Design a protein around this ligand. Structure first.
Ligand SMILES: CC(C)c1cc(-c2cc(N)on2)c(O)cc1O
Length: 207
């Protein structure tokens, strides 16, 4: 297991997300679904010229899996996946510059719900999760697990878990007071409200 420090700007963003009073926490799901859609777009585009890129799975979709026993909500996609280098490099985002721009915008009056416009929507997961685990598999690289409970560091290790084929799984270990996001009707409501027109099937698992 390798442990890394977040860049200062990202630690700052995470602390702000965790410590700022903001009731509209449901936006985290929209941001993660949006990220999954973008990753699915990427593998779709690559497959247009190299159909064999889909050898690792032809179906392009998103699964939402609540687990009340583990107090987790997991968002799974079969998108392009990330390399180890991507994970370390702020999970394939331009988080350093994006954070700067998000900050500049917040000063220009913007609110936290606009976070996705700056390429750092992922970190909104920390509105509802005490810990986030990201499992990912990119074609021709191994499966890796990233994990962080904030506090300035993250870990990366090779994943010995269930082989994914290709794509990304975001596991949200929810805060004790955020278990509404495991309720079927609540997830349905959020998806219908914020993600009604995503171009890939979204399947909400039941328990
Ligand atoms: C963790 C977060 C930023 C995120 C990244 C990817 C992703 C990005 C790439 N290149 O591959 N997979 C994704 O599918 C979903 C996500 O919520």
């Amino acid at each position: 297991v390798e442990t890394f420090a977040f860049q200062a700007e990202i630690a700052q963003l995470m602390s702000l997300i965790i410590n700022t009073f903001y009731s509209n926490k449901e936006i985290f799901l929209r941001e993660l679904i949006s990220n999954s859609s973008d990753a699915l777009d990427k593998i779709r585009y690559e497959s247009l010229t190299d159909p064999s890129k889909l050898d690792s799975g032809k179906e392009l979709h998103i699964n939402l899996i609540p687990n009340k026993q583990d107090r987790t909500l997991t968002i799974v996609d079969t998108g392009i996946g990330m390399t180890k280098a991507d994970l370390i490099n702020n999970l394939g985002t331009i988080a350093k510059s994006g954070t700067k721009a998000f900050m500049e915008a917040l000063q220009a009056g913007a609110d936290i719900s606009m976070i996705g416009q700056f390429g750092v929507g992922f970190y909104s997961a920390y509105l509802v999760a005490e810990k986030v685990t990201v499992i990912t598999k990119h074609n021709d690289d191994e499966q890796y697990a990233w994990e962080s409970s904030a506090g300035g560091s993250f870990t990366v290790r090779t994943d010995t878990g269930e082989p994914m084929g290709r794509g990304t799984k975001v596991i949200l270990h929810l805060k004790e007071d955020q278990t509404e996001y495991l309720e079927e009707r609540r997830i349905k409501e959020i998806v219908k409200k914020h993600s009604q027109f995503i171009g890939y099937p979204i399947t909400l698992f039941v328990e």
